Amino acid sequence: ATNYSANQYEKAYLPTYLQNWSPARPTKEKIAAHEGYTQIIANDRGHLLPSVPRSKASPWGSFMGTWQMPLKIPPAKVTLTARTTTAADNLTKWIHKNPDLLNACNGLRPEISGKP
Amino acid sequence: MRECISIHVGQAGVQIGNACWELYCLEHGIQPDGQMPDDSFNTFFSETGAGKHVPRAVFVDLEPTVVDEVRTGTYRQLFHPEQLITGKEDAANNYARGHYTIGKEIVDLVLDRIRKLADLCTGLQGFLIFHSFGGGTGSGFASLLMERLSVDYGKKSKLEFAIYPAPQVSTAVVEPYNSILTTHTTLEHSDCAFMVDNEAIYDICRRNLDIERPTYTNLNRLIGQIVSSITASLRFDGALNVDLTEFQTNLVPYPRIHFPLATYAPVISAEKAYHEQLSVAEITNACFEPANQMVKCDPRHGKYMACCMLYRGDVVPKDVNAAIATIKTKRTIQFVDWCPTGFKVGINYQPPTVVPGGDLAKVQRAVCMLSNTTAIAEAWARLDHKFDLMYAKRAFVHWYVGEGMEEGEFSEAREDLAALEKDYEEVGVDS
Amino acid sequence: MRECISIHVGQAGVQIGNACWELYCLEHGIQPDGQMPDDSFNTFFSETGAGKHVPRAVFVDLEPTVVDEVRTGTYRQLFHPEQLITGKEDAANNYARGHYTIGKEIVDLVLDRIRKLADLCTGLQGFLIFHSFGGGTGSGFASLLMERLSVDYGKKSKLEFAIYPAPQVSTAVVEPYNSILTTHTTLEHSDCAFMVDNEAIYDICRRNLDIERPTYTNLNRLIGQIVSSITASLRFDGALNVDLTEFQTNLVPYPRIHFPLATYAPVISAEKAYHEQLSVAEITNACFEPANQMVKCDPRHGKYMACCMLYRGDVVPKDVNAAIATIKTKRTIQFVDWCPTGFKVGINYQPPTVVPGGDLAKVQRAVCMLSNTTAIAEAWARLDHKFDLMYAKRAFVHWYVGEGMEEGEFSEAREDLAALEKDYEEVGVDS
Amino acid sequence: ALPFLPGNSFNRNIGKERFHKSQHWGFCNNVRMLVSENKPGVGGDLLYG
Amino acid sequence: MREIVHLQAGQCGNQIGAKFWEVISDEHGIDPTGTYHGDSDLQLERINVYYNEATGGKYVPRAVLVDLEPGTMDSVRSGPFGQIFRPDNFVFGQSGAGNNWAKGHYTEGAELVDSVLDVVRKEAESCDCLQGFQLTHSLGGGTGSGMGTLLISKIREEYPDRIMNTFSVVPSPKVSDTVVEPYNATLSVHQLVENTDETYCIDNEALYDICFRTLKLTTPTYGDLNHLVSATMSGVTTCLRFPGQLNADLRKLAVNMVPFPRLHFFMPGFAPLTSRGSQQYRALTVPELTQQMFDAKNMMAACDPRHGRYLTVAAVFRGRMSMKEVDEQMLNVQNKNSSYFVEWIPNNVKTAVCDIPPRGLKMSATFIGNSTAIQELFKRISEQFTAMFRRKAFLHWYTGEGMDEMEFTEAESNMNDLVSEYQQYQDATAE
Amino acid sequence: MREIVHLQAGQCGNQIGAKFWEVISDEHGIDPTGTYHGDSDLQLERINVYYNEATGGKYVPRAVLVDLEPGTMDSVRSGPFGQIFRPDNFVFGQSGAGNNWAKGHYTEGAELVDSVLDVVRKEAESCDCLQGFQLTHSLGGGTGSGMGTLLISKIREEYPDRIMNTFSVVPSPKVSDTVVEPYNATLSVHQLVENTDETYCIDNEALYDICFRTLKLTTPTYGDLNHLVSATMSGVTTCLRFPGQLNADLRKLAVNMVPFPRLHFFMPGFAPLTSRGSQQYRALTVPELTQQMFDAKNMMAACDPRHGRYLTVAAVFRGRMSMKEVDEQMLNVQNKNSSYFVEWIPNNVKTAVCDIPPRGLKMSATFIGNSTAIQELFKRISEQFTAMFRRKAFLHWYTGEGMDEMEFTEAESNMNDLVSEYQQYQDATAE
Numbered sequence A: 001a002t003n004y005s006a007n008q009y010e011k012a013y014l015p016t017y018l019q020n021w022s023p024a025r026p027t028k029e030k031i032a033a034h035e036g037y038t039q040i041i042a043n044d045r046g047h048l049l050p051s052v053p054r055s056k057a058s059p060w061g062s063f064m065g066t067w068q069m070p071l072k073i074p075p076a077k078v079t080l081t082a083r084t085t086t087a088a089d090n091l092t093k094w095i096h097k098n099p100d101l102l103n104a105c106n107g108l109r110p111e112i113s114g115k116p
Numbered sequence B, C: 001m002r003e004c005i006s007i008h009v010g011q012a013g014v015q016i017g018n019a020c021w022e023l024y025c026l027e028h029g030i031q032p033d034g035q036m037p038d039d040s041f042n043t044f045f046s047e048t049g050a051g052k053h054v055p056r057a058v059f060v061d062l063e064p065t066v067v068d069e070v071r072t073g074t075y076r077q078l079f080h081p082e083q084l085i086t087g088k089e090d091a092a093n094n095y096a097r098g099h100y101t102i103g104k105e106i107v108d109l110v111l112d113r114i115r116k117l118a119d120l121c122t123g124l125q126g127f128l129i130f131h132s133f134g135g136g137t138g139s140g141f142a143s144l145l146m147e148r149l150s151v152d153y154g155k156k157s158k159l160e161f162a163i164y165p166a167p168q169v170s171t172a173v174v175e176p177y178n179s180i181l182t183t184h185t186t187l188e189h190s191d192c193a194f195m196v197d198n199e200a201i202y203d204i205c206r207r208n209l210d211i212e213r214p215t216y217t218n219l220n221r222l223i224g225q226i227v228s229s230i231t232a233s234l235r236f237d238g239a240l241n242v243d244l245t246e247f248q249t250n251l252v253p254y255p256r257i258h259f260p261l262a263t264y265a266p267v268i269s270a271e272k273a274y275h276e277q278l279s280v281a282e283i284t285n286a287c288f289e290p291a292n293q294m295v296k297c298d299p300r301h302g303k304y305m306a307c308c309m310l311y312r313g314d315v316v317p318k319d320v321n322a323a324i325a326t327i328k329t330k331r332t333i334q335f336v337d338w339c340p341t342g343f344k345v346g347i348n349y350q351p352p353t354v355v356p357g358g359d360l361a362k363v364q365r366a367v368c369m370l371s372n373t374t375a376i377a378e379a380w381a382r383l384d385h386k387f388d389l390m391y392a393k394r395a396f397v398h399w400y401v402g403e404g405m406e407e408g409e410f411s412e413a414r415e416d417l418a419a420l421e422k423d424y425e426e427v428g429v430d431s
Numbered sequence D: 001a002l003p004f005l006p007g008n009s010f011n012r013n014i015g016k017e018r019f020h021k022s023q024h025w026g027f028c029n030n031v032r033m034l035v036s037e038n039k040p041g042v043g044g045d046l047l048y049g
Numbered sequence E, F: 001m002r003e004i005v006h007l008q009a010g011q012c013g014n015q016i017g018a019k020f021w022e023v024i025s026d027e028h029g030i031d032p033t034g035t036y037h038g039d040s041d042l043q044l045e046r047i048n049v050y051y052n053e054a055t056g057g058k059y060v061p062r063a064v065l066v067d068l069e070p071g072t073m074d075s076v077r078s079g080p081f082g083q084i085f086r087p088d089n090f091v092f093g094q095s096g097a098g099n100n101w102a103k104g105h106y107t108e109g110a111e112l113v114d115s116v117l118d119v120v121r122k123e124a125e126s127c128d129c130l131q132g133f134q135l136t137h138s139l140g141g142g143t144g145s146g147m148g149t150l151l152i153s154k155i156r157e158e159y160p161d162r163i164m165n166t167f168s169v170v171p172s173p174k175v176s177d178t179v180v181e182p183y184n185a186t187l188s189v190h191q192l193v194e195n196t197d198e199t200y201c202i203d204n205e206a207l208y209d210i211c212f213r214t215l216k217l218t219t220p221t222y223g224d225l226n227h228l229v230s231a232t233m234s235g236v237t238t239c240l241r242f243p244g245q246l247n248a249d250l251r252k253l254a255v256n257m258v259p260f261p262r263l264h265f266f267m268p269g270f271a272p273l274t275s276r277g278s279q280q281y282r283a284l285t286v287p288e289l290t291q292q293m294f295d296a297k298n299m300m301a302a303c304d305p306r307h308g309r310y311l312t313v314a315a316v317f318r319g320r321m322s323m324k325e326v327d328e329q330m331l332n333v334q335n336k337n338s339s340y341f342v343e344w345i346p347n348n349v350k351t352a353v354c355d356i357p358p359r360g361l362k363m364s365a366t367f368i369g370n371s372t373a374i375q376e377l378f379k380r381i382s383e384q385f386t387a388m389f390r391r392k393a394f395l396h397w398y399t400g401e402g403m404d405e406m407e408f409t410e411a412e413s414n415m416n417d418l419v420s421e422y423q424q425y426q427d428a429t430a431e
Ligand SMILES: Nc1nc2c(ncn2[C@@H]2O[C@H](COP(=O)(O)OP(=O)(O)OP(=O)(O)O)[C@@H](O)[C@H]2O)c(=O)[nH]1
Pocket: B009, B010, B011, B012, B013, B015, B016, B061, B062, B063, B090, B091, B092, B093, B094, B132, B134, B135, B136, B137, B138, B139, B163, B170, B171, B172, B198, B216, B217, B219, B220
């Protein structure tokens, strides 16, 4: 799951140098230390205990197919350099309209730059 | 030294046996008569006084005619006459008949024959046991066999290669009753399973090998390649030798979740190798394309909990780590939260051999991948759906009750799978 | 390392791909089987496991017969079989069926083939995409693929060679509807365009190449010459090489203005080239001539905003500059006020190659030109004129709605192009 | 023809087939031993000496 | 006189140990048969350090090859220097652990550790004065990480005063070849801090880089990797075998590298590695030898020392040098980068000179360095272990050996006090 | 001793520096292999200034080639003097900046800044007494103008007192080869004016002027242009490499040229440039050098000093001459042309003499002049800046990189404050 840091050798495992020319997973560059040992958090067969707090994320990942993906996807590259005030807003609202698309693993993470 | 015994069960198991045991003859150079015309074959064969080598296999069936073909085929003198065990009457697509009435007749005979193969070997590594979830013998008798093999060998590995019901096509109507009941045994009396349905290999063969009209002998050969690359490190030297006990530990996170998925690549024809470069990057991406898993499921809708990689041939630790690192830096794949390092790597030297009359071209490198994933959880939900709507109105129950098992096993077997589906969900919830 | 992937779509895409890739093999030296009897070819070809070079191209069409002519042609062995992707039924001049219903079938498959191709590339510069505004597959699917390409590949360039429909001639009745709808989708999901209508190339071949009865091949050869010179700086060295990134930045001044106009020169016949010397100054004045643009619009009806120059052959840097100085000192060529320096010049060494049986006489020097201007805004005006008077009666829309797209999408798409004309007005006003 | 050093080594395994392995070592009479001195090496070819 | 008994555990230990013995055999001119064929007299003045005398002028390595699986050792036997090891030293069981630390340390190790102890107690009592033992293994396995740690535990009880070094291999972050790697890693380092004089942390992924970028090998197999680590094990004991202007040995670093008994984790690196194209453009000098030595890329562990502070440094040298130059460099590097060297110890670095260079090379050097950047390797491993151990993942294999859960709790606790006490020395004031 | 590390950034940076290293290799008698084949002692006495030493009597340049696109580096390595460079010093990324200063300075130019800092740190600490560094690039580009400014801002912080020259190329008004050229030129002088010690403003159209009119070459390639620039880069440091009657170096010129830290922009010029026919009618005398030396048509910038005041002037003579005639000739031009020299500094001319002439030539001289006629350049750019910047054009490329808008406003302010500050020294009273 979590990708760690090769420190000096991180250049060798950057996503583009590994010929993976798509959006990729983040890199956990720094970590902290844990004092003492750790309590058992699951019983047999890997079920979480009643007392522990659990996430609300779906237990089956988050992947969108073609027929599930929204019919009008705004682009990833958004740049507000000469847009009118309202034309800036309808573009920004359009991206935020569907919260499922931005949150999926296969879904796009948009970039936004500039003000009208 | 390392030695293994194959416990092929059923018409599925016997016909699989012809494909794989032919492959072990060409790999080692053993003639169909049984002599080499250098001791590299002790794990599967075993020599006698006359110089002949007899296989370490036990073909079992409850009806004669499949094994009868083996007794008069090309390799009739290759196999010992005693190990091809049959029966006069079979279960006929019935778990109960193959578990309580007809199985108990010849259970004792085969449990003597297994011992007479066990004592010849010094270091047993495990038992490769092949059966099918569908037919009566592959479901019933093979389930009894694991129960009595557990008590006689507490610690020995019991690998379980299986044929799982296809999602749409099936050659039996009562089969969902069969598949539900036998999963008790492969839950508490097995160490690893390799469920694979035929419809996936039907799809893979015609999509990749261009054979638009396949047959079971085509399918039997790919399964022969999968078992071959599992035991290749046991058989020939490798940079990273991987044993049977190695990947049993590094595939099963919990005793009730021991159901990985097989994946083989490349599987391409001779014309399609004439245009295509093969490098370790280009075949290890094929292990994660959802179009190539030998079960009809998508890992993109689940998350991997353990993946074991089996390289073979002209492969270098150069390309292995670059390809694995490229796999990790992908947002498409999902790993469970508790498993940050979920890879087991095996590197071997001897490239896969080519059988004449086969379908694949001969290649310089290959891979097999075994990935325990929670995306298989979808298969039981459909299986428990179809078992439900048949058992809601007591269809076919009179056949099983008449054989002499209580009906309380039917309801109890449904709940264990009901609990097992929730198991595959709680591992999907991260804290 | 300099690499481009071609994503040719539709009958225009396939027939252009035949002429374009026929040029590349003769340009590098690859025999039609795939065997070279210098790593420069890696920009288009990829080395394999037999000693071949297979293209980095994806031919796609929704009707089989256009692609089947490739599969039984001269180059049946050069192209990998997996790359040529077809389907049973075609969109049949309909954006809706090409976008929402039948385009969506093969969007998963062609995304996988593109991914494998992009995996093999080391540093891919961008994506070259050839299609048409008229056909359903060339417009409906290519809009869907462009939209789904941006989410998969956010930053990488997506160039769009395309066929803008004609003012006067036409092969279709419905194409105003199809052309309107695809610019709205691809306005925010595109980087550059090089629209070329066929009559504008038709008159040039008639007037300059003596061929009074041309066919689509004579046009497809000329289109290939444009694509050859764009990537020429990647392939062979030059005094001032250009990339795909370099000329996209110096040709799109505002986020919604990405419609340059291509121009090639010289284009003369062998008998007509004998009497006429070709110098740098002679051919660079031919690049600004209204009679020689392959868009039917005279830039005397507007102002240039950016010009990208692509020189090639026996050319001298001092004479490129003496030519541009003369070009500026003539008010027939008028520039915007906010682009005082509106040129992007590149110089390459290798003279353009000639295919036997073609049209152009082989020449020592050649020029290509990509001039963005507001004299294209009149072309959108006539297209809305053709879009209006069909739309008032709601003709042909029963086809589109019956496929599965709402009529409210018709009004919004025309409204955006109503804004795009006013966009092309404000930049053309001097302060 | 090079001195033994890191970087000065070339494999002979290129194009060699039959990477078989022999059963050197093994138990006889419950005693660890090298069973048989006459078995060949990897590839079914004779050893040195 | 001063003898070294070479211990050995597991597949990583055997393939490292097989390469190591041939490396010093070239140094001492020992042919595969085993007899003296070298020329100089200093090649036989201290051969008893590693070799034991046998009749007929034969030399026998003082090696103890240990492995639970008999078949890794036949690949050792079938190598070039295969028949140089005495068969009575080969110790093997029948059933392997399968990357299972619990199997190799508690249940199956306890049956094999009697026989290895008889071998070493025979090898110890043979020589007069042992300097100490030396074991090579890996922490991510079952035998070397397992039984190999119980060996070290037992010798220190028997032989408290002798030294005991370990060229272990620690698992890497980016690519992991075993899913139970962090289970075996934490359960092993807890043993290393309690009974061990020195440990050398090697990571295969750091060896991967150096073969790629410093030597520029196109296909570096594991033989070249095993060559690099053996070139380091030679460089530490070289002054024990050849004379020098400034002498050293294994104990001269022990007292001088370890400021407190808990901190004995060092990071080696080899100096004279140049690519075969770089040999043309270089100058064999001492200032270049210190430059490449201290460069962070040259490290063979998986942590950047520029994050932490160098506690102590040891740089041993080979070849006939001038000792003003080997002394002015080490004052130069301590002064220029004063931030990476702790202040409460002025003169952190130790130097040694051995006249005899490695065979076939003019000048060489070997770097040992203790830094407060190793703590990340425990910090990363700890949370790779906490995330696994929270959910009881892969615990049934380990708790099926009968061990309680509180050895794991005291395993991370003895790992985590270290990183706190390691981090305190980094944040320490001089005055 | 007294060394120079030659930096190199971009396509203009590489093809300039590739010619430059060839130029001085002939002066120091270096074959393409890299060995010394000269005759006189003085050709190998101070070769350590530019060349590093290696085994076998070999000399590698102290150069650092940097480019974001690999395409330019390939043509450098394939020249005659292409294998002389050390392979490690080549540093390059995967994708280009596309003439975008923002792309080259922040987004991808930062990933490449860590490695170029390592090579620079490698060469800087080898040389015992480093006089300074030297860079050649172009301001109209993406990486030379882009990342090339980032190196300067970083190296100044590490090495403050060392000299930092740039032989940059400033854009030309009459013909421009980049549309977005004004933006990169403005944003880089703002880097230059803060972080530079001396700057030379070489312009290509001035070189086109000289090749057409002075040398009268019909076909001047860019190689001939790169010969002209290098003939100055040798003359700045020739007094550093060969002894003379009155020596100098970079610092003697730097101290004596810039009266205030803000003003460090000069115009180079090379004296003995004669056409082919003119060679017949000439006589090598010092006055004939000076007559061509100060002629405004010999300048290699686009500004006529007849429009401004010569602040301070350098002339570095090369050849065995008389100290009377060289002194009387700088005297005569200082009295005849009284108005073009400032009035608050007497004797505005700095002279130096180096005895050894350039190879194949008898006499020569070099011109470095500082004047207020160089604000003719900066006002010239700012008009082309505010014209584009009023309409916020070509800005989404820049503001899409994450940079804000105040950078443009201050960069014009710093640029426009400079010319107002430059203007007041033109209009200055002495008393
Ligand atoms: N993959 C694969 N499946 C097979 C093959 N042969 C038979 N099967 C499967 O076997 C199932 C039928 O049960 P069998 O194994 O043939 O018969 P059985 O196990 O002896 O049980 P009975 O028929 O009651 O005697 C079918 O559903 C097939 O899917 C084969 O060659 N390959």
